[PDB]
Structure 1
Amino acid sequence: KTVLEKSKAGAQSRFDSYGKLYDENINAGENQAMTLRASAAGLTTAVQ
């Protein structure tokens, strides 16, 4: 039983860990990077 219990705990750690990452979606840092790429594109009319 103890062996199975440790297995449960292992799976639980993974479940919650992947849960977290999934729930996070895009990291705030990742959001800033997207913003910058978009911002650069936005200069097209100014440059022209």
Structure 2
Amino acid sequence: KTVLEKSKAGAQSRFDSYGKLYDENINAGENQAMTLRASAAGLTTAVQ
């Protein structure tokens, strides 16, 4: 019984991890990298 319980604990440590990860889909940093590329993509106007 305790063997099953330890396996349950492990499996749930995982569900909790992938839960918390899925919940913050895009990290502050990651969104900043994306918006940087967005900024570089613009400004065709000015160089024209």
What's the offset of the Cα at 1:45?
0.6
The runs of 5 or more residues in structure 2 that have no matched partner are: none
Report Cα offsets for 1:1-37 as digits up to 9, x if no partner. 0000000000110000000110000000000001100
For these two proteins, the number of residue pairs brought into alignment is 48
Which residues of 2 match residues 29-48 of structure 1 at below 5 A? 29-48=29-48
Q: Which residue in 1 is equivalent to 2:5?
A: 5
Normalised by the length of structure 1, the TM-score is 0.95
Normalised by the length of structure 2, the TM-score is 0.95
What's the offset of the Cα at 1:43?
1.2
